[PDB]
Amino acid sequence: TIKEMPQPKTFGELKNLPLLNTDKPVQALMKIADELGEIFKFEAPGLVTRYLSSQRLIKEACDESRFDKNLSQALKFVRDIAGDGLVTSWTHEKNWKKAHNILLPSFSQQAMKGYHAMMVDIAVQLVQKWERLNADEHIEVPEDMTRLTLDTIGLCGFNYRFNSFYRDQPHPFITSMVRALDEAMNKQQRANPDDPAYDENKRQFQEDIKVMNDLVDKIIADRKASGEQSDDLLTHMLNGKDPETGEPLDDENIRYQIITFLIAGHVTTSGLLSFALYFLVKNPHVLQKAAEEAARVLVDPVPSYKQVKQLKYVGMVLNEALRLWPTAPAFSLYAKEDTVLGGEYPLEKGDELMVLIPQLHRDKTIWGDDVEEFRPERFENPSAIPQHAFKPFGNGQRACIGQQFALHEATLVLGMMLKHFDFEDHTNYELDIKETLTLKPEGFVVKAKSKKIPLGGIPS
Ligand code: HEM
Ligand SMILES: CC(C)(C(=O)c1cccnc1)c1cccnc1
Numbered sequence: 001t002i003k004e005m006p007q008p009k010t011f012g013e014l015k016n017l018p019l020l021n022t023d024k025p026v027q028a029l030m031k032i033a034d035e036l037g038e039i040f041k042f043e044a045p046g047l048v049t050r051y052l053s054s055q056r057l058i059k060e061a062c063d064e065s066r067f068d069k070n071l072s073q074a075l076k077f078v079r080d081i082a083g084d085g086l087v088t089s090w091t092h093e094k095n096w097k098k099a100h101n102i103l104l105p106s107f108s109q110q111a112m113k114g115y116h117a118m119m120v121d122i123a124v125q126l127v128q129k130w131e132r133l134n135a136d137e138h139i140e141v142p143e144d145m146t147r148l149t150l151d152t153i154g155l156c157g158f159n160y161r162f163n164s165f166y167r168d169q170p171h172p173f174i175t176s177m178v179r180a181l182d183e184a185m186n187k188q189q190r191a192n193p194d195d196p197a198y199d200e201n202k203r204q205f206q207e208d209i210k211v212m213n214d215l216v217d218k219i220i221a222d223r224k225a226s227g228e229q230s231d232d233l234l235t236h237m238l239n240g241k242d243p244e245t246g247e248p249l250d251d252e253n254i255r256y257q258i259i260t261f262l263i264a265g266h267v268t269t270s271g272l273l274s275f276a277l278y279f280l281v282k283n284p285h286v287l288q289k290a291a292e293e294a295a296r297v298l299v300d301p302v303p304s305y306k307q308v309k310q311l312k313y314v315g316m317v318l319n320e321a322l323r324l325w326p327t328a329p330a331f332s333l334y335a336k337e338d339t340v341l342g343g344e345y346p347l348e349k350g351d352e353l354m355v356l357i358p359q360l361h362r363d364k365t366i367w368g369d370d371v372e373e374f375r376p377e378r379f380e381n382p383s384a385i386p387q388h389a390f391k392p393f394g395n396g397q398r399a400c401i402g403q404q405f406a407l408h409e410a411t412l413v414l415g416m417m418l419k420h421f422d423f424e425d426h427t428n429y430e431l432d433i434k435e436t437l438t439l440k441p442e443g444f445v446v447k448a449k450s451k452k453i454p455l456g457g458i459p460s
């Protein structure tokens with residue numbers, strides 16, 4: 001049964017473009033979904049896409065034989081930063097599967113066990129940072145989470161210490177990255193991108209890329225004059241070869257993956273931890289139930305790998321935070337061939353789809369009407385959830401390669417946070433979600449009273 005697909009207001013030649021003229025476009029989209037329903041057509045000068053919001057339509061979109069990963073307009077712009085790295089490369093593109101084969105061992109199970117000791121190294125620094133604050137001082141939550149997450153991927157991934165906790169301004173890499181990513185997001189609303197009104201923007205962009213590449217230069221150089229070295233993500237990135245082709249990555253594609261993992265390896269994880277701590281202070285009974293598990297499981301000066309894997313309610317807290325606000329709010333898909341979606345919406349070949357993940361996670365036919373409420377108990381049994389109902393990490397072979405990395409780090413750190421501190425909503429923070437292609441609550445500050453529980457010595 002063919003259906004006519006709804007479409008919001010069109011402003012003439014600009015079509016639906018002026019609707020996304022906001023600091024918060026994803027949220028503007030979610031409200032559009034609330035009016036228009038399962039699916040709606042969205043076009044602008046350039047191309048057309050279709051935003052899905054129901055589990056009914058998305059589980060069909062997640063069929064890898066009917067649909068493949070599409071680079072949305074945003075990704076096509078991010079591609080100017082990350083090139084043909086794992087994130088911004090097409091599925092059937094040369095360097096994707098090549099690097100997918102080379103780098104997947106770096107996120108294997110015994111790769112994770114290797115990262116743990118270093119993950120704790122940074123986690124301790126976060127705790128001690130807070131242990132050493134004065135009585136009056138506030139904790140800027142997303143700022144410090146970014147320090148932790150960036151330093152973790154920098155150390156675990158490349159054996160490079162950003163030393164973010166030795167700076168009270170963000171690292172030069174961060175500032176250039178945020179500007180470059182904000183530019184990619186801002187260029188979407190740009191009528192004539194090559195209008196000289198944005199020469200000013202293109203000049204700052206070339207500079208931010210200079211700064212970011214200057215750091216990749218440091219990482220590769222430090223590895224040169226080393227002799228340990230040894231076996232991390234950069235090691236595979238430099239020496240590994242694709243089994244199917246017997247080829248290593250270019251001198252060029254390597255630089256793209258480093259930039260890819262320096263950005264992707266922290267940008268969304270920082271948001272998750274921030275959203276988790278936000279919901280916890282806004283829901284104190286949840287906070288204490290998780291604080292108990294933290295105190296119960298973590299019985300040593302430093303958490304072990306097994307102990308992190310036993311923080312089950314904490315993991316649920318993280319998953320529920322990812323439900324309400326997936327810090328990677330969307331991914332795109334294209335029809336491999338002609339097909340029908342849900343037996344109602346006929347798609348041509350190459351037609352583009354957008355998975356609106358926060359609205360998917362609010363599907364009342366899956367979760368009930370208490371969708372906006374923060375109950376970690378939804379995930380107390382994983383199998384209870386329909387397939388393709390919970391998609392904070394993408395789908396299929398294009399799903400997040402660092403999903404376990406993020407979740408292990410986030411659980412470990414949140415576990416130590418709850419073992420060592422109580423938390424006060426010092427400002428009664430009104431949630432203000434900042435969008436930079438990713439979701440993150442800005443202006444969020446808390447206060448921590450230490451439980452005076454000692455730490456220990458860092459492993460290896
Ligand atoms: C809460 C944390 C994270 C979230 C919510 C998240 C989300 C996602 C999503 C939605 C995708 C799909 C992209 C698409 O389909 O267009 C993805 C892919 C990817 N992510 Fe993550 N991610 C997280 C953490 C990480 C970490 C820690 C790393 C690296 C250490 C990472 C690196 C990547 C890479 C390289 C891809 C593309 C891989 C491929 O297509 O072969 N992400 N992620
Ligand atoms: C791919 C995705 C979703 C993303 O939107 C992205 C990628 C690079 C820079 N900024 C955002 C992402 C972001 C962070 C971690 N993994 C994936």
Ligand code: NI
Nearest residue numbers: 001002343344
């Ligand atoms: Ni029918």
Ligand code: NI
Nearest residue numbers: 136137138426
């Ligand atoms: Ni104060």
Ligand code: NI
Nearest residue numbers: 210213214217
């Ligand atoms: Ni340079």
Ligand code: NI
Nearest residue numbers: 105231232236
């Ligand atoms: Ni190896």
